[PDB]
């Protein structure tokens, strides 16, 4: 490895060998069908709301999130980088696809597949990833840095459907070597969203854009139709000329063929035919190729940038609504703008790299934090782009343009609900901290739903009872499903009835006040906007107190985020959330000078606090609840309200001494007596130190609950416990001794390491550790 020295990969990047097999991968632990795409994954490319593309550590473009809200894992084999190398004075060169694998059928059989093992490495520190190629048969060593411009406090470039591939080539040998790097891409119009005639009308054109000191050559892969539909638009790949490289191209090769139309050119001398051909295809798949060729002298280094863009302006959901994606604000809505996007990337990628470095450097340069923590902190952010992220710039056919751009991030793909609020309580830390204008827009979207009534009915999955879809004054579970109508039909979730949940209204209030505090305690307008909904939310939750202790009663069913685990009476979890929400509402009361609300919630608070303490404090920790069979279970998340109170600077809702004892107990039991403290915090443990078997969820570690708990321990000075707790989640996700969940962190695992719900929003809570 002579190439690593020539580039700058951070030590905290996650690493794996190109072509590495992983032996101990986990699988779903439920009996119903559940996504399991394998451990062959990588950091995604693409902006927020753009559709994302998962290029894996093996090199393949395989995890397709271009259909917003869907996850489609299939390798499009034509999509590759390939290399040609010939030593000066040799008869022939070698040509190799940089993909550790091969097609399943006979298409592209002429290409050289199966990039060998132990010949290069993949590195990721989101939004960057790298590959290095260190192959005994490639005398010139190569590396690529690939990224999209995902940049905190930037809502523009962060939306772009673009990726940059910055290549570095270095010749450590004593002879001149001729080198070519070729990008191939299938015209993927019709890959989704098109019913019939799926390749028909696809065509490819070549753009050559020359100004002084800027030459760009690109392929634009579109369709002859000018229809404005979800399926139609353009892909582009291209390259920017640098000194000492020549560009060649091929407009049209057949992907549903042996590939020799392209490969017979590339494998001769690494130079393509420069043959333009806009002839549209009918049945056959087609693709384009862009190549650079250069001679490297001994000791010489060369850098060349490629890019990929995709202008697919319309997203369609299952309920029938069609929306424009966010980036259309910057480039247009007609689906004929892929070249503009690509050019902007090729001309500005160096600025974008520095903007990324500028936001990563304060964390990376902090020598008090271990590398593993930096690995997790940055790489968990993959989900912001990969979580089916929807970001609208108008409804298709909309008359009056609106001021705001609605946003949604999925809870996950198996439970396909937008902004699942009981989950976003944990998972939304990166948005409030790094993209606060998005965070505030989402919370306003929730404010707007408080008094919505929808008397249409649904069957509650867990019991078979019919229930009302949306009750006035109850915050919704979610803002819809990508299978139905995001932002329009709320409460797509139906396993339980969210209108009787005891955590949603509380969590909503805590999120509102969190978003004011963590953006500098200045946004009174935001508190103004949300105030009526906050009062309504708390007032409705108060009505669910049935024995007048001042606290909502859990109803002996799962009526909160732990939606198969029954709570009954006053629970530590919903009880502490209630207390904190009440105290947050007092403070909003003072800021907005609503002394009536202040007095009201202050008296509710003092009564509930006294009773919470009496009912649940047992001398060592807070009991699970007052009325369940396993009421004395030690719950990892028992003091979630106080966790948030620390972040919101609300002081102590429970006594310092009791919180410390409770946290030490949780570490001693839920962490250290669960698989020797190496897998996070199990949710429920019996006081005899055996895991609570009342429900599956009690026997699960929740990744986002565990990272949040680590945050809580950290604010309370339990530094070792905090990082030891979080480390188990890191280890299971990323480490060789884990279960292979990189770039698909799940909700949960059980003691055997098998998982539930990969690609999950909750573990974004790791960012609470940076408050
Ligand atoms: O929806 C999000 C929610 O999901 C919870 O998980 C649920 C699944 O969503 C649901 O599909 C699953 O349904 C099971 C059910 O539990 C079983 O009891 C049932 O068993 C059948 C059996 O297969 C039949 O042979 C027999 O005729 O009837 C029995 C009884 O109905 O099978 C269905 C379908 O697989 O239940 C899951 C929970 O156990 C998550 O737990 C939750 O966290 C999510 O929010
Ligand atoms: Ca009560």
From TrEMBL:
GO terms for cellular component: membrane. It comes from the Bacteria. Its EC number is 3.2.1.45. One of its GO terms (molecular function) is metal ion binding. The keyword Oxidoreductase does not apply. It is an enzyme of class 3 (hydrolase). Residues 407-769 form the Glycosyl-hydrolase family 116 catalytic region domain. InterPro entries: 6-hairpin_glycosidase_sf, 6hp_glycosidase-like_sf, B_Glucosidase_GBA2-typ, GH116_catalytic, GH116_N, Non-lysos_glucosylceramidase. The keyword Hydrolase applies. This is Glucosylceramidase. It comes from Thermoanaerobacterium xylanolyticum (strain ATCC 49914 / DSM 7097 / LX-11). The lineage of its organism: Bacteria, Bacillati, Bacillota, Clostridia, Thermoanaerobacterales.
């Amino acid at each position: 490895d002579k190439i690593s020295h020539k580039i700058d990969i951070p030590d905290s990047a996650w690493t794996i060998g190109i072509g590495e097999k992983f032996k101990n991968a986990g699988h779903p632990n439920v009996k119903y069908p559940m996504i399991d795409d394998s451990y062959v994954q990588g950091a995604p490319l693409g902006g927020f709301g753009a559709g994302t593309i998962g290029r894996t550590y093996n090199g393949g473009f395989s995890r397709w999130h271009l259909e917003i809200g869907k996850n489609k894992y299939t390798t499009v084999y034509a999509n590759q980088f390939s290399v040609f190398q010939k030593v000066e004075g040799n008869k022939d060169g070698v040509a190799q696809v940089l993909y550790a694998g091969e097609p399943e059928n006979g298409y592209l059989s002429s290409w050289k597949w199966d990039y060998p093992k132990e010949s290069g490495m993949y590195y990721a520190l989101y939004p960057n990833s790298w590959y290095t190629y260190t192959n005994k048969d490639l005398p010139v060593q190569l590396a690529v840095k690939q990224f999209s411009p995902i940049i905190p406090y930037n809502y523009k470039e962060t939306s772009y459907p673009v990726a940059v591939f910055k290549w570095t080539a270095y010749n450590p040998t004593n002879k001149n070597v001729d080198v070519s790097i070729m990008f191939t891409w299938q015209n993927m119009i019709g890959f989704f969203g098109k019913q019939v005639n799926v390749n028909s009308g696809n065509f490819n054109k070549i753009i050559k854009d020359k100004s002084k000191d800027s030459e760009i050559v690109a392929a634009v892969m579109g369709n002859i139709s000018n229809d404005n539909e979800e399926w139609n638009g353009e892909y582009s790949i291209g390259v920017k000329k640098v000194p000492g490289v020549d560009i060649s191209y091929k407009a049209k090769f057949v992907t549903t063929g042996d590939g020799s139309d392209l490969w017979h050119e590339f494998s001769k001398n690494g130079i393509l035919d420069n043959k333009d051909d806009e002839t549209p295809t009918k049945q056959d798949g087609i693709g384009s190729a862009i190549a650079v060729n250069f001679k490297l002298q001994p000791g010489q280094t060369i850098e060349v940038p490629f890019a990929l863009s995709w202008d697919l302006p319309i997203m369609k959901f299952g309920g029938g609504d069609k929306w424009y994606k966010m980036y259309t604000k910057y480039f247009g809505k007609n689906g004929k703008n892929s070249f503009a996007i690509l050019k902007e990337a090729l001309n500005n990628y160096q600025k974008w790299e520095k903007m990324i470095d500028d936001w990563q450097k304060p964390i990376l340069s902090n020598k008090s934090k271990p590398d593993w923590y930096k690995t997790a902190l940055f790489n968990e952010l993959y989900y912001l782009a990969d979580g089916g992220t929807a970001w609208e710039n108008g409804k298709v056919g909309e008359k009056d343009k609106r001021t705001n751009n609605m946003f949604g991030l999925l809870g996950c793909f198996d439970y396909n609900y937008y902004e699942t609020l009981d989950v976003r309580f944990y998972g939304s830390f990166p948005l409030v901290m790094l993209w606060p204008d998005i965070e505030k827009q989402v919370m306003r979207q929730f404010a707007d739903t408080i008094n919505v009534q929808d008397s249409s009915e649904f069957k509650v999955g867990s019991n078979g009872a019919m229930a009302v879809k949306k009750v006035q004054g109850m915050i919704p579970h979610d803002l819809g499903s990508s299978y139905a109508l995001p932002w329009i039909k709320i409460n797509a979730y139906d396993w339980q009835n969210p209108n009787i949940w005891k955590d949603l209204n509380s969590k909503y209030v805590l999120l509102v006040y969190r978003d004011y505090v963590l953006t500098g305690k200045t946004d009174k307008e935001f508190l103004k906007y949300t105030w009526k909904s906050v009062k309504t939310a708390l007032d409705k939750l108060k009505e669910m107190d049935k024995d007048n202790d001042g606290i909502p009663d859990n109803e002996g069913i799962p009526d909160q985020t732990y939606d198969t685990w029954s709570m009954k009476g006053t629970s530590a979890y919903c009880g502490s959330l209630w207390l904190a929400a009440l105290k947050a509402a007092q403070e909003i009361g003072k800021v907005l000078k609503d002394n009536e609300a202040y007095i009201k919630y202050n008296e509710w608070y003092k009564i509930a606090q006294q009773n919470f303490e009496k009912e649940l404090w047992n001398g060592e920790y807070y009991n699970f609840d007052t009325e369940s069979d396993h009421k004395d279970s030690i719950m990892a998340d028992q003091l979630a309200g106080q966790w948030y109170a620390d972040i919101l600077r609300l002081g102590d809702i429970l006594p310092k001494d009791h919180v410390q004892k409770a946290l030490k107990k949780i570490y001693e039991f839920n962490v250290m007596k669960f698989e020797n403290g190496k897998m996070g915090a199990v949710n429920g443990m019996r006081p005899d130190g055996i895991v609570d078997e009342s429900d599956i969820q009690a026997q699960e570690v929740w990744t986002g609950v565990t990272y949040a708990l680590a945050s809580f321990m950290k604010y309370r000075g339990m530094t070792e416990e905090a990082y030891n707790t979080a480390y188990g989640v890191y280890k299971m996700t990323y480490d060789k001794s884990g279960k292979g969940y990189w770039f698909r962190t799940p909700e949960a695992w059980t003691k055997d390491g098998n998982y539930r719900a990969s690609m999950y929003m909750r573990p974004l809570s790791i960012w609470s550790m940076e408050v």
